[PDB]
Design a protein around this ligand. Structure first.
Ligand SMILES: [Mg+2]
Length: 67
């Protein structure tokens, strides 16, 4: 019995590789995955130019995106 934001906040962190990664205004790396926004944490590796990044712990931000 949770709001969608709550559902996102409770999601487990993900170890993985994603495309369509978008950089934050503050240098954070973000993805929209299964209706939740996640932020890359710990060691993050991206292509110099282009979307793809790997992170051992993509963590939900609690934001429910429309992008
Ligand atoms: Mg948690």
């Amino acid at each position: 019995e949770q709001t969608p934001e709550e559902i996102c906040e409770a999601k487990p962190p993900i170890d993985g590789v994603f495309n369509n990664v978008f950089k934050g205004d503050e240098g954070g790396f973000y993805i929209n995955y299964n209706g939740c926004e996640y932020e890359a944490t710990g060691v993050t590796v991206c292509q110099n130019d282009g979307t793809v990044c790997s992170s051992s712990a993509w963590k939900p931000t609690g934001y429910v995106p429309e992008s």
